[PDB]
């Protein structure tokens, strides 16, 4: 449904915004990223928040809790 | 407003951050979509309680009522 001219104007105003704000791009996380294990323990406390109170566990929930 | 009337707990006193005076009253109601969602949530509490203990029905009512 998107015409090419719409797509080029979208990309043009996004380049215009991200350069008007001098936005440096998000890097790929390095091998030795500084805050890395804190990001990991946040992403895993986000996952155990489902599995702290429930009792009935199927194959996939038990498998990911083991992960 | 013609007559400034002190009103219910559901009104908000909008202090002007320039002159430090209550200059508008924002009146609150709960939106009809959220009222229907709460009704559907209590209906789900009734419907998932096929054969459920009475204390768990009470705890579901307390959870949805506090929420």
């Amino acid at each position: 449904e998107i015409t090419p001219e719409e797509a080029t104007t979208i990309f043009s105003v996004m380049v215009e915004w991200l350069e008007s704000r001098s936005f440096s791009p998000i890097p790929f996380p390095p091998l030795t990223y500084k805050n890395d294990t804190k990001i990991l323990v946040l992403a895993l406390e986000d996952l155990k928040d489902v599995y702290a109170s429930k009792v009935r566990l199927n194959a996939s929930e038990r498998e990911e809790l083991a992960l | 407003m013609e007559e400034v009337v002190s009103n219910d707990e559901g009104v908000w006193d909008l202090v002007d951050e320039r002159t430090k005076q209550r200059t508008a009253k924002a009146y609150l109601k709960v939106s009809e979509e959220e009222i229907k969602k709460f009704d559907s949530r209590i209906r789900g509490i009734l419907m998932a309680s096929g054969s459920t203990t009475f204390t768990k029905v009470a705890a579901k009512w307390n959870t949805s009522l506090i929420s």
Partner: protein
């Protein structure tokens, strides 16, 4: 339908129960305003309890 011999004590219960809570809420104000606009004796009771406080 409380007679005059307890209305000051009722206003004191309203005061001392407004002060239990963490912050001030408008509920006690709306309450007290309707109580004052009902009858003259409640207005004299709030006069006497502000002076008392």
């Amino acid at each position: 339908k409380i007679a005059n011999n307890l209305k000051k004590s009722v206003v004191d219960i309203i005061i001392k129960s407004s002060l239990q809570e963490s912050t001030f809420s408008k509920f006690y104000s709306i309450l007290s305003e309707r109580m004052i606009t009902f009858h003259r004796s409640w207005q004299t009771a709030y006069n006497e309890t502000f002076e008392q406080n």
